[PDB]
Design a protein around this nucleic acid. Structure first.
Ligand SMILES: Nc1ncnc2c1ncn2[C@@H]1O[C@H](COP(=O)(O)OP(=O)(O)OP(=O)(O)O)[C@@H](O)[C@H]1O
Ligand SMILES: [Ca+2]
Ligand SMILES: [Ca+2]
Length: 341
DNA sequence: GGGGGAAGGATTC
DNA sequence: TTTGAATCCTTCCCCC
């Protein structure tokens, strides 16, 4: 199998630049404002000018403004980025029928039946890159290798505006020398636990005791890392169906007062249904963030799709159940819909 | 013992 | 560490 992964560079920020080129060269920070106060919320993403100084995905807006008070701060316009994204993906479906859209700015192309060797893969890469730069003025990074994971790792090493192949020889090497925390799917919480087992490289999972690994990171991740270590990575390039849609919102102030919360909940539901757009869910879950930033949710599943009225009544019950089973005040309330027809 | 599916906390981005 | 959106993934429970 030959895999070509495409990762759009600092995507949200890059899109704002394209729609307004005068932003080029300037640090641009795309933000998601929470509303509890002035500048409340986190940064979704920033261009490289802003990242050189620490401003990156996740840092509070307030802190980003302390570092770069004159940077350009823009509100997240997901709808716009999604449309630009869809056009780019469609350009990609032209280089292969077997494409997996892993997210708004990532896609995996199984190009076996399109190229014979990496040289030809690399060259198809350049085509793809140029086509996107020309057509949309968006720079992306291409990763090419034997499977989805190493094709992603190839992109991670070459971004931004890069292109990199990782052949079978580099893979065997990476299995030995790559820091495990750089393995797609392994996050901070799993990364640290792996350090607590003497595991820093993929190869290290082959010596530990399975039941010990299984019971520390989980049977799924365990089996996952072992398969990569034995270089037998098992999971093809399939489509991908967004399986859930929701919305969480922040309230002006905390409270466990049903009538105070309802307006927010109902707003979450309306926005949620706007996105559903033709998709009929069968399950609904209500989500609440307590005053001490703890998450709590309660959902229910039906044998038929959920009309908006049912969604309306059912969410009050779920919210009430929550308020009942938890004594803390609520800070944020949201809903989530899934199991579509 | 274990398939199958809901539920809801945990973790990844 | 805030701080949103979505999936991951143990776990509980019905029941053969
Ligand atoms: N801590 C966080 N809080 C909020 N959104 C986050 C956080 N971490 C990641 N994201 C979201 O995920 C996106 C960053 O994802 P990721 O590492 O996958 O992107 P990428 O290929 O490098 O990013 P980019 O657009 O940043 O160049 C953005 C946002
Ligand atoms: Ca990207
Ligand atoms: Ca991304």
């Amino acid at each position: 199998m030959i895999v070509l992964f495409v990762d759009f560079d600092y995507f949200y920020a890059q899109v704002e630049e394209v729609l307004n080129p005068s932003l080029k060269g300037k640090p641009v920070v795309v933000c998601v404002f929470s509303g509890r106060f002035e500048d409340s919320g986190a940064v979704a993403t920033a261009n490289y000018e802003a990242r050189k100084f620490g401003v990156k995905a996740g840092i509070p807006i307030v802190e980003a403004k302390k570092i770069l008070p004159n940077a350009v701060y823009l509100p997240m316009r997901k709808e716009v980025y999604q449309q630009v994204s869809s056009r780019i993906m469609n350009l990609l479906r032209e280089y292969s029928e077997k494409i997996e859209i892993a997210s708004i700015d990532e896609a995996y192309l199984d190009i076996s039946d399109k190229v014979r060797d990496y040289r030809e893969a690399y060259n198809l890469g350049l085509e793809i890159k140029n086509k996107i730069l020309e057509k949309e003025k968006i720079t992306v990074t291409v990763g090419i290798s034997k499977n989805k994971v190493f094709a992603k790792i190839a992109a991670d090493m070459a971004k931004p505006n890069g292109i990199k192949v990782i052949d079978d020889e580099e893979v065997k090497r990476l299995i030995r020398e790559l820091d495990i925390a750089d393995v797609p799917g392994i996050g901070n919480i799993t990364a640290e636990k792996l350090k607590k087992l003497g595991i820093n490289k993929l190869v290290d999972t082959l010596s530990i005791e399975f039941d010990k690994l299984k019971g520390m990171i989980g049977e799924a991740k365990a089996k996952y890392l072992i398969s990569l270590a034995r270089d037998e990575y098992n999971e093809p390039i399939r489509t991908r169906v967004r399986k859930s849609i929701g919305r969480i919102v922040t309230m002006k102030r905390n409270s466990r007062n049903l009538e105070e919360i309802k307006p927010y909940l109902f707003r979450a539901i309306e926005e949620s249904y706007y996105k559903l757009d033709k998709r009929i869910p069968k399950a609904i879950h209500v989500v609440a963030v307590t005053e001490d930033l703890d998450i709590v949710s309660r959902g229910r599943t039906f044998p038929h799709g959920i009309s908006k009225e049912t969604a309306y009544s059912e969410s009050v019950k779920l919210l009430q159940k929550i308020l009942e089973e938890d004594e803390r005040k609520i800070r944020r309330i949201g809903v989530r819909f899934s199991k579509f027809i």
